[PDB]
Amino acid sequence: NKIVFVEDDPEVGTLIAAYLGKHDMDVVVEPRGDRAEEVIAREKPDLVLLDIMLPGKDGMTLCRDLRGQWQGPIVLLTSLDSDMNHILSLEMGASDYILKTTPPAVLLARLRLHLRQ
Amino acid sequence: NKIVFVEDDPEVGTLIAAYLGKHDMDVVVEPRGDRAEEVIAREKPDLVLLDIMLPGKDGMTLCRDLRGQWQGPIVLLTSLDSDMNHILSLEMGASDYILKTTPPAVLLARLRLHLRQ
Ligand code: BEF
Ligand code: BEF
Ligand SMILES: [Mg+2]
Ligand SMILES: [Mg+2]
């Protein structure tokens, strides 16, 4: 299964794409908010995994836009521990909001959860 | 909008029923694991909130038993901070697994999510 993962920090970007790899997932990592929407239009993935603090455009705005043009699981994933952000993401159409401090095995388990609708 | 809440602790049982009540959902609280299913069968709720450490029958076995015979959303809410439990219950057909430590406006935000999804 195919996952576009919009993330600046190239270290976590490869580390996560590595882990998700061992467990049978095709991960196209994008490090610009400006470039996603395009990459996401090209790669045509079945789930989309957004960071928040991106360069250029940002995660949450990116989420709001993507909600119109396409109707599949969008999952946020950020260092920003904000109850307000969490509650607003879900209001705008995100399917989950996950702290980066979540154990990878649990991040995998939720991604699998969403790739069932 | 109706929810049965299997939960032994009388204190959390009230706070959740009062809070979710203020927000226009009808919460029925059953304090025994072995008695839920019967309470669920009758009350015919829209979503099921399970504690894990319950008398009679634990929330996790109770969850996989519902899967055969009820197809609404089941949300675990527990004090049990365990990666294995979380990952296991997503795979046994729960829709979410929430630490009781989660702020209540965030709990509401997620329940509202599943009462659409
Ligand atoms: F870059 Be993430 F939002 F931590
Ligand atoms: F009793 Be519960 F599982 F916190
Ligand atoms: Mg960032
Ligand atoms: Mg208990």
What is the Cα–Cα distance from A50 to A94, expressed in whole angstroms? 10
Distance, first Cα to last Cα, chain B: 15
Q: How far apart are CA A10 and CA A113, in angstroms?
A: 26
Q: What is the CATH number of the domain that holds A25?
A: 3.40.50.2300
**Which one, of B49, B40, B95, lies nearest residue B70 by Cα?**
B40
Find the domain containing B50 and state its range: 1-117
Backbone angles phi, psi at A16, to 5 degrees: -60, -40
Experimental technique for the deposited model: X-ray
Measured distance CA(A99)–CA(A12) in Å, rounded: 13
Pairing, β B26-30 against β B2-6: parallel
Ligand 1 within 6 A of CB of A49: no
Residue A6 tokens, joined:
């919009």
Domain count, chain A: 1
- Strands, E assignment, B19-95: 26-30, 47-50, 74-78
Report the pocket of ligand 2 as residue ranges, CB < 6 Å. B 8, 51-53, 78-80, 100
Burial A13-40 (b: 16+ CB within 10 A, else e): beebbeebeeeebebbbbbebeebbebb
A74 Cβ inside 6 Å of ligand 1: no
Testing ligand 2's pocket by substitution, the residue of B53, B63, B75, B81 carrying the most ligand atoms inside 8 A of its CB is B53
Interatomic CA distance for residues B79 and B99, integer angstroms: 6
| Helix pair A83-92, A59-69: axis angle to 10 deg | 10
B117:A112 CB<8 A: no
Distance in angstroms (rounded) separating the CA atoms of residues B95 and B3:
14
Residue B72 identity:
G
Distance (Å, whole) CA A29 – CA A36: 10
Alpha helices in chain A, H assignment, sequence order? 10-22, 39-42, 59-69, 83-92, 104-114
d(CA A38, CA A26): 18
